Structure 1
Amino acid sequence: ENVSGISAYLLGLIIGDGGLYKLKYKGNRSEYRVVITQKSENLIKQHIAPLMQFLIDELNVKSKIQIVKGDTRYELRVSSKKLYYYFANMLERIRLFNMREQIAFIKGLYVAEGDKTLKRLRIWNKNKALLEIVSRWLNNLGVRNTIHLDDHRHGVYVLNISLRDRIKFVHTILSSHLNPLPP
């Protein structure tokens, strides 16, 4: 607080499009990574990185933000035991998120993997328990939604946000000004 909104939003982006990795090497070497992947260097270097930078600074984390180019996407990586655990421990507590963290998380998750055309409002994931948590948050915010198994090939569910509540979902979650990068 109020790094907690930005944290929740980055967790959305990490859960969606990145990951939390604990490596073991030959030995007894190790590494802890916080990862967001994305195709464009804008929205990585210009939107995501400074949000991560802010948090790293607030949390006193000694590690660099690394931006590594791949053939198919960019990777924002923080190599840091402290931040790995910061985000992993937060994920464990996800059910206790307040409204601020709820909205920020759902915003980052949608950015990761929502339907971008917004002709339809859809979030895709294999993690059904995760989408069921988001579904209950959305019901509490008055945004009707259903979950079903969308992709039978990959075991990938969709949470479809009802277009009845289109304006409420876009207003309240997607174009939310909550917790900006910071005045």
Structure 2
Amino acid sequence: ENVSGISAYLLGLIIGDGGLYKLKYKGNRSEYRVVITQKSENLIKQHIAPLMQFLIDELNVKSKIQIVKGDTRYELRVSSKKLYYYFANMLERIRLFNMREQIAFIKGLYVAEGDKTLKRLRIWNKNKALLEIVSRWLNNLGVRNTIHLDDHRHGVYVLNISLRDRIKFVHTILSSHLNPLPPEAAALEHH
């Protein structure tokens, strides 16, 4: 289905390049944030925001999409308790994603945390359990891969997709038309 695919894609971006934040203020006021950050303003406004707006309308979320310009990056932000729990509940059920959602998620995670040269196929993260889930998904998809500690300074692991399966990964996962195409995959397909 369309909504679940777009959801899983966004979650990959969120978990990779953003986050889910439950805030308490003096008040005792509060706030619930769904966030994706990115240096490219275009990527946020043109690729990401329209997907998020679609999801917001489909879920009848009344919150608006904020785009905040930071010193080093743009922030796409939705301030919404409803949208926050929607992604947070999805995240704790992540092991139950069907094939379609898995691929959408892996696309999203790769856009966020991946080696964008596509010369090497790598995903970095400190969350080892998250990479190990993605690893099992990939193996099941016929894409071989390994996980090692890539940065001993900060505790950042890397998931390395074997170049032996580069074509399978790029064409059947990054380029699947069952959910939104990541930027470079879309560009390759249109040449």
TM range (shorter): over 0.9
1:104-133 per-position Cα deviation (integer Å, ceiling 9, x unaligned): 000000000100111100000000000000
Give secondary structure in 2 for the equivalent of 1:20.
strand
TM-superposed CA distance for 1:53, in Å, is 0.1
Higher-helix-fraction structure: 2
1:24-77 per-position Cα deviation (integer Å, ceiling 9, x unaligned): 001110000000000011110001000000000000000010000011000000
- Alpha-carbon distance in structure 1 between the residues aligned to 2:121 and 2:102: 17
- Alpha-carbon distance in structure 2 between the residues aligned to 1:179 and 1:133: 20
- Alpha-carbon distance in structure 2 between the residues aligned to 1:174 and 1:11: 15
State which drifts further: 45-54 or 172-181: 172-181
- Alpha-carbon distance in structure 2 between the residues aligned to 1:132 and 1:179: 23
1:148-180 per-position Cα deviation (integer Å, ceiling 9, x unaligned): 000000000000000000000000111222224
- Alpha-carbon distance in structure 1 between the residues aligned to 2:18 and 2:167: 29
Match in the other structure for 1:58: 58
- Alpha-carbon distance in structure 1 between the residues aligned to 2:92 and 2:150: 26
- Alpha-carbon distance in structure 1 between the residues aligned to 2:106 and 2:180: 15
Change (3 A) 1:6 1:153: same
Structure 1: gaps of 5 or more residues: none
Matches within 5 A, 1:19-168: 19-168=19-168
TM-superposed CA distance for 1:182, in Å, is 14
- Alpha-carbon distance in structure 2 between the residues aligned to 1:76 and 1:2: 22
TM-superposed CA distance for 1:2, in Å, is 2.6
- Alpha-carbon distance in structure 1 between the residues aligned to 2:36 and 2:182: 21
**Identity score, percent:** 100
TM-superposed CA distance for 1:19, in Å, is 0.2
Change (3 A) 1:182 1:159: closer
- Alpha-carbon distance in structure 2 between the residues aligned to 1:116 and 1:110: 8
Normalising by structure 2, report the TM-score.
0.93
